[PDB]
Design a protein around this ligand. Structure first.
Ligand code: CHL
Ligand code: CHL
Ligand code: CHL
Ligand code: CHL
Ligand code: CLA
Ligand code: CLA
Ligand SMILES: CC(/C=C/C=C(C)/C=C/[C@@]12O[C@]1(C)C[C@@H](O)CC2(C)C)=C\C=C\C=C(C)\C=C\C=C(C)\C=C\[C@@]12O[C@]1(C)C[C@@H](O)CC2(C)C
Ligand SMILES: CC1=C[C@H](O)CC(C)(C)[C@H]1/C=C/C(C)=C/C=C/C(C)=C/C=C/C=C(C)/C=C/C=C(C)/C=C/C1=C(C)C[C@H](O)CC1(C)C
Ligand SMILES: CC1=C[C@H](O)CC(C)(C)[C@H]1/C=C/C(C)=C/C=C/C(C)=C/C=C/C=C(C)/C=C/C=C(C)/C=C/C1=C(C)C[C@H](O)CC1(C)C
Ligand SMILES: CC1=C[C@H](O)CC(C)(C)[C@H]1/C=C/C(C)=C/C=C/C(C)=C/C=C/C=C(C)/C=C/C=C(C)/C=C/C1=C(C)C[C@H](O)CC1(C)C
Ligand SMILES: CC1=C[C@H](O)CC(C)(C)[C@H]1/C=C/C(C)=C/C=C/C(C)=C\C=C/C=C(C)/C=C/C=C(C)/C=C/C1=C(C)C[C@H](O)CC1(C)C
Lengths: 214, 222, 118, 221, 217
């Protein structure tokens, strides 16, 4: 309840009481009153934007986990997320967990073909309903997508939805970090973190790549 | 088929839940694809509609303009030395003979880029200003997006039944060109070769010569 | 983890009791008697139940998270998921033992052999 | 109706039809919304604020991006890195960052201290701008005045309206120049004043079209 | 366009007279029964079923005679006998018949067992197709649907009409092409995919003319 209504926390802390967009009232999860730009003024775009955020969020959370696990595990050769795709062209191919025989994928075209066919059905079902569910909330279908019934209580669902978006926004921000850190450092996020941990004053953005960025 | 409620949609069967209300199959090319909700406002949608057609028409001219010198060079005039490729033709203005139309010295023989810019600014500027003004000496037919009167000498817009199918044919050929032009730009940067050369390569070894051949081209290197 | 086939691991541990490459502090003779006694006690406890449904779904200490301790449809769906994973595993392990009889390799070994066979 | 109203000047001059929502009610309304981005009144309001804030930052930025280079060229002062797109790297030099060279000025040594103070200082300052603060609470968002108009050049309503047009037009000119500095810096990789010097020396053999354009596809520059 | 009296015809504009019994209402009707073999409505029904069964088998056969050859000469896999007119001989080899060249796939060694198993399985399958069975009861002898349309691509009757045409059209092309496979194999001992490569290599010199033909006398 603290996350909804007019008494909800806001992105500008104390300096946000007099600075709140009219459309952002406290009805939807993750409402911190951060709509400085004119975006989402019209409810139609705001409703469309709210879904895209949760989608970009759930994707980022999957991406953030998956951009770290293979780099943190041996057998995968601690491959960097921005260097994982090339493995399909290696002689061995993509052997999950490094265990030979698992997938042994070697054709990039074949992988893309199955992905396109499967993802098109999946994304189509998510938009116009399908076998998993029909006539359900577009972003929060539940049912087959909530097997453990963790959100049965409306109150719990509300707080959990706040947890989902806040974790997602952190993942989206950190994924954007992965993109830039890789394009600048050239190393995986875990390697960048380890370097900082060792010698923070020496291993950081400013003391290593900031000068050559111009 | 391409108009009204039961029209063609972008997601085919799984499109019912993806059709924005404001999209009701009135304008041409309404497959019901505005997931982002950019054209929610009636006014914003109208502006984007004009922008889409203008881009589509430039794209269509661009597609022919980015292949015609290369075609003739491979078989035909065979005179645009390194100017056949679209992303290496503009540099021909600084040539010893400069820009020679059809590779013919007698034609144009331009060798001053500043003059070209000034000439284009006044020419394109006036026409664009007239398009924005919504009114000019030539016949405008009272349609800023579709000024049939003077711009349609052949009178192919005579009957609305052909007009309705022609207008969707325009945007669909147009959208394809815009999508392909975006292709020309991307393919050019990644491959560096002319678009028609890229095709030859794909036909040579489709499994090897494809987009994933240049997958590791832009990899940040420690 | 060990790189040894599941069939070959039986004899290897018998000759040298070990887990995850760590030698266990117990001669195989004590482990053999312990396994029989431990499993004997465990199975006698299981047989004490007299409710036919509870013999298949004891709950209580075996359902600490209370996921399917009710009569809801979630309980029915969860039980449907269990038997499907159960029947799959029964057929799958039948695959393990038949493949080890024919090919000679274990699970991961059969997978690698098939991939190389091409 | 010289600047506001229906007889206001337009971005295409004679051949110009202003959008319905653009009715010459705000400064710099040359009726230019061909993309229809400010059709929504709420979005238009928020967009106007971004323009004024961007213009003021750009006006400060444009003046600040050339002042060290102008002084370095004329020999008025020696900076560790006078070029604007290199001033940030001064903090990593031997003696740190000294204002106008003089070691007795600022004499900053650590980027972390600069970063943390800026976050605290600008965090409070921007908080005061949106939620109001020490300078006053309840004042116009884009034009607070009061403490920010000590000289009172906006007391006359008519002059204030005309001067608001001047702020945007100098600001829009500054914003275009800033983008120019960035693009020129990325291409020429030389300070903005240096680019001007070269053009004045040989304007026909130093222009982008003659030096970089011909090498922007296939032949790197 | 493909149904009714205004349907397209096999002879195009020159079609003119068409068989009276050969009206629309059926997929793939181009008004071609010049031999007058389906004048009897009972025989016409039977011939329609025979065409779609010969067509469906041809589509499977056309794809099945090209894929092992394509994979072999594309380096995708190594078969015992890629060419279709020799794949049967694989059972008479040292390693029997291995699917995709993998000794741990199928690994058949006895042609009898292959023949016996096919007779039993095909016999029951064909019996199920003509009298119903485990997959479903018989309603349309050539368009069962239900268990045979799990994806539901023909749920809408309008799409079902146009889709039937696509099958007979694609099927007929398969029958003609598979008939070519039979002849090309006899005239040219090379596989059909090899023939296509030769025609692409030198169409002027590699074709049914400038080769064979005169040998066929
Ligand atoms: C008054 C002079 C005037 C001139 C010389 C032009 C010239 C041009 N207009 Mg144009 N316009 C002019 C007035 C006006 N236009 C428009 C509205 C448009 C549109 C909507 C479009 C043009 C386009 C074009 C270009 C396409 C060529 C063409 O006619 O294609 C038709 C004839 C043969 C192909 C062309 C250079 C097209 C363009 O920009 O192409 C990319 C285009 O799409 N004009 C209006 C508003 C009613 C005008 C009002 O005066
Ligand atoms: C009379 C003809 C006339 C023409 C053709 C233009 C054209 C233009 N005016 Mg403009 N103006 C004109 C008169 C006048 N303007 C102004 C005041 C302004 C302002 C204040 C601004 C403009 C701007 C612009 C540009 C808007 C950007 C654009 O649409 O890019 C489309 C261009 C292309 C797609 C490519 C063009 C060719 C390429 C350069 C080669 C544009 C090129 C804007 C701008 O960009 O300022 C620099 C702007 O902010 N004008 C006044 C005084 C009130 C005018 C009086 O006659
Ligand atoms: C609009 C603001 C702004 C812009 C356009 C630039 C642009 C640039 N800075 Mg830079 N800076 C800016 C602000 C700031 N810089 C620095 C400190 C530095 C250093 C130490 C260096 C640069 C450098 C550079 C250049 C190389 C790019 C790079 O690595 O960025 C680095 C960018 C940063 C370190 C600042 C990060 C963003 C900044 C804190 C945003 C300010 C707003 C809010 C505090 C953010 C709230 C969230 C480049 C042209 C490099 C250079 O000069 O190369 C020769 C370089 O070595 N800047 C600080 C103080 C911490 C800034 C504060 O606002
Ligand atoms: C890391 C090393 C470092 C060093 C050696 C210096 C050195 C200097 N800094 Mg500097 N700075 C350093 C880092 C940094 N500074 C700044 C930001 C600034 C600013 C904003 C300013 C300086 C100023 C100065 C100069 C002030 C001295 C002066 O001229 O006094 C002149 C005489 C006086 C100021 C009066 C007497 C001062 C003296 C301390 C008396 C007070 C004693 C107190 C009793 C003790 C303190 C507690 C009391 C008040 C209860 C000086 C040479 C100042 C400057 O440039 O002035 C010219 C200045 O305004 N620095 C930053 C970013 C946040 C830094 C980051 O690392
Ligand atoms: C949007 C999210 C996302 C995306 C796009 C990807 C994408 C990718 N992942 Mg990834 N991953 C993600 C999330 C994601 N992941 C998350 C959240 C995790 C944490 C669980 C992982 C953990 C992970 C690992 C460990 C690995 C990948 C790998 C890969 C790459 C190939 C995957 C593959 O082989 O086919 C799809 C994968 C499957 C279909 C899984 C098959 C089922 C497995 C093999 C069975 C379980 C192991 C099995 C029991 C092993 C038997 C022997 C064992 C007991 C010793 C690919 C680019 C592999 C790689 O090499 O990276 C280049 C790799 O090894 N991911
Ligand atoms: C006029 C100002 C200015 C100038 C002259 C430059 C100049 C340069 N920048 Mg830079 N940049 C600027 C502003 C500027 N930047 C600003 C304001 C930002 C913030 C958005 C950035 C963010 C930025 C990034 C993230 C990167 C650069 C990079 C580069 C270098 C190009 C590397 C390359 O592509 O070749 C070859 C490719 C590489 C060397 C791999 C990288 C180059 C010397 C790149 C770099 O730092 O190179 C090391 C790069 O990664 N810039
Ligand atoms: C989704 C898709 C296609 C969808 C097809 C659809 C919907 C079907 C169309 C139909 O509707 C019609 C018309 C008619 C309907 O009656 C029937 C169907 C059949 C339904 C294509 C994706 C196709 C996607 C492809 C092939 C993308 C290839 C990407 C590559 C090669 C990327 C390479 C690199 O990006 C890396 C990896 C790293 C970078 O640094 C460098 C570069 C080189 C950029
Ligand atoms: C609020 C506001 C208000 C006002 O008004 C205005 C403004 C300010 C504008 C606004 C803001 C906004 C924002 C902030 C945005 C952001 C975004 C993002 C960053 C996203 C991400 C996003 C991101 C994401 C999704 C991500 C994704 C990822 C993924 C899937 C991954 C994948 C993968 C893996 C796993 C691994 C491998 O090896 C590789 C791969 C295969 C690759
Ligand atoms: C009107 C219209 C209409 C239709 O409808 C649509 C459209 C077309 C879209 C529109 C248009 C728009 C536009 C034009 C925009 C532009 C923008 C910009 C460029 C900005 C800048 C912007 C820019 C800016 C701010 C700038 C800033 C800067 C600064 C602060 C500076 C800083 C600094 C200094 C001093 C110096 C040193 O050495 C460095 C530093 C430290 C770094
Ligand atoms: C319309 C008309 C009208 C009037 O009546 C006249 C007339 C003329 C009589 C008519 C016409 C008719 C016709 C044209 C007929 C034709 C037919 C055909 C050719 C069929 C095929 C048919 C064909 C077919 C089925 C085929 C099938 C195939 C197959 C099974 C294959 C198998 C196989 C494979 C995969 C592979 C291996 O390694 C070998 C094998 C094992 C061997
Ligand atoms: C629908 C949707 C829905 C949701 O909701 C949202 C969203 C997603 C946002 C949406 C989407 C949209 C889109 C897709 C867009 C696109 C665009 C493009 C790609 C292009 C244009 C546009 C494009 C274009 C115009 C193009 C153009 C081009 C051209 C003219 C050409 C030029 C040229 C020539 C001739 C020749 C030379 O030698 C070279 C050059 C000079 C180079």
């Amino acid at each position: 309840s603290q996350w909804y209504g007019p008494d909800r926390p806001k992105f500008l802390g104390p300096y946000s009481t007099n600075f709140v967009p009219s459309y952002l009232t406290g009805e939807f999860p993750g409402d911190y009153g951060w709509d400085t730009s004119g975006l989402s003024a019209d409810p139609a775009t705001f409703a469309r934007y709210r879904e895209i955020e949760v989608i970009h969020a759930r994707w980022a959370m999957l991406g953030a986990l998956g951009c770290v696990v293979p780099e943190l595990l041996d057998g995968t050769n601690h491959i960097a997320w921005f260097k994982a795709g090339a493995e399909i062209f290696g002689d061995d191919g993509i052997q999950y967990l490094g265990i030979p025989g698992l997938i042994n994928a070697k054709s990039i075209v074949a992988t893309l073909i199955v992905q396109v066919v499967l993802m098109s059905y999946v994304e189509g079902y998510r938009v116009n309903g399908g076998p998993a569910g029909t006539g359900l909330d577009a972003v929060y279908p539940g049912g087959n997508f909530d097997p453990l019934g963790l959100a049965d209580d409306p109150d719990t669902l509300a707080e959990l939805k706040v947890k989902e978006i806040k974790n997602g926004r952190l993942a989206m921000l950190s994924m954007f970090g992965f993109f830039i850190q890789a394009i600048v450092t050239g190393e995986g996020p875990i390697k960048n973190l380890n370097d900082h941990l060792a010698d923070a004053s020496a291993n950081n953005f400013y003391a290593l790549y900031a000068k050559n960025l111009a | 088929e391409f108009y009204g409620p039961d029209r063609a949609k972008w997601l085919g069967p799984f499109s019912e839940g993806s059709v924005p209300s404001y999209l009701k199959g009135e304008f041409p090319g309404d497959y019901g694809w505005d997931t982002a909700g950019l054209s929610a406002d009636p006014e914003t949608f109208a502006r984007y509609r004009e922008i889409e057609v203008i881009h589509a028409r430039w794209a269509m001219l661009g597609a022919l303009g980015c292949l015609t010198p290369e075609l003739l060079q491979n078989n035909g005039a065979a005179d645009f030395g390194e100017a056949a490729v679209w992303f290496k033709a503009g540099a021909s203005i600084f040539n010893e003979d400069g820009l020679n139309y059809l590779g013919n010295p007698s034609l144009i023989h331009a060798q001053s880029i500043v003059a070209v810019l000034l000439t284009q600014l006044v020419i394109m500027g006036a026409a664009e200003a007239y398009r924005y003004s919504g009114e000019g000496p030539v016949e405008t037919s009272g349609d800023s997006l579709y000024p049939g009167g003077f711009f349609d000498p052949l009178g192919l817009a005579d009957d609305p039944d052909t007009l309705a199918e022609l207008k969707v044919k325009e945007i669909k050929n147009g959208r394809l060109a815009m999508f392909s032009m975006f292709g020309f730009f991307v393919q050019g940067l990644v491959t560096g070769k002319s678009p028609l050369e890229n095709l030859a390569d794909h036909l040579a070894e489709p499994s090897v010569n494809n987009g994933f051949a240049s997958a590791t081209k832009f990899l940040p290197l420690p | 983890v060990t790189g040894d086939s599941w069939v070959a691991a039986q004899t290897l541990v018998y000759n040298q009791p070990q887990y995850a490459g760590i030698d266990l502090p117990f001669d195989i003779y004590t482990l053999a008697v312990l396994n029989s006694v431990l499993m004997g006690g465990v199975e006698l406890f299981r047989n004490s139940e007299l409710d036919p449904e509870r013999r298949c779904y004891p709950g209580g200490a075996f359902d600490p998270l209370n996921l399917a301790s009710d009569d809801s449809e979630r309980t029915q769906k969860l039980r449907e998921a269990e038997i499907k994973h159960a029947r799959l595993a029964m057929v799958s392990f039948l695959g393990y033992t038949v493949q080890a009889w024919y090919t000679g390799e274990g699970a991961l070994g059969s997978l690698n052999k098939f991939a190389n066979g091409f | 109706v010289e600047w506001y109203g229906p007889n206001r000047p337009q971005f295409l001059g004679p051949f110009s039809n202003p959008p319905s929502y653009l009715k010459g009610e705000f400064p710099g309304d040359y009726g230019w919304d061909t993309a229809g981005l400010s059709a929504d009144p709420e979005t238009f309001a928020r967009y106007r604020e971004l323009e004024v804030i961007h213009a003021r930052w750009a006006m400060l930025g444009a003046l600040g991006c050339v002042t060290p280079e102008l002084l370095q060229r004329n020999g008025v002062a020696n900076f560790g890195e006078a070029v604007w797109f290199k001033a940030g790297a001064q903090i990593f030099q031997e003696g740190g960052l000294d204002y106008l060279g003089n070691p007795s000025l600022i004499h900053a040594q650590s980027i972390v201290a600069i970063l943390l103070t800026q976050l605290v200082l600008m965090g409070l300052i921007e908080g005061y701008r949106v939620n109001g603060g020490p300078a006053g609470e309840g004042l116009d968002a884009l034009y607070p005045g009061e403490a920010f108009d000590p000289l009172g050049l906006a007391d006359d309503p008519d002059t204030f309206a005309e001067l608001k047009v001047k702020e945007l037009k100098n600001g829009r000119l500054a914003m275009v120049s800033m983008l120019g500095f960035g693009v020129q810096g990325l291409i020429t990789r030389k300070g903005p004043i240096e680019n001007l010097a070269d053009h004045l020396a040989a304007p026909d053999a130093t222009n982008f079209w003659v030096d970089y354009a011909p090498k922007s596809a296939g032949i790197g520059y």
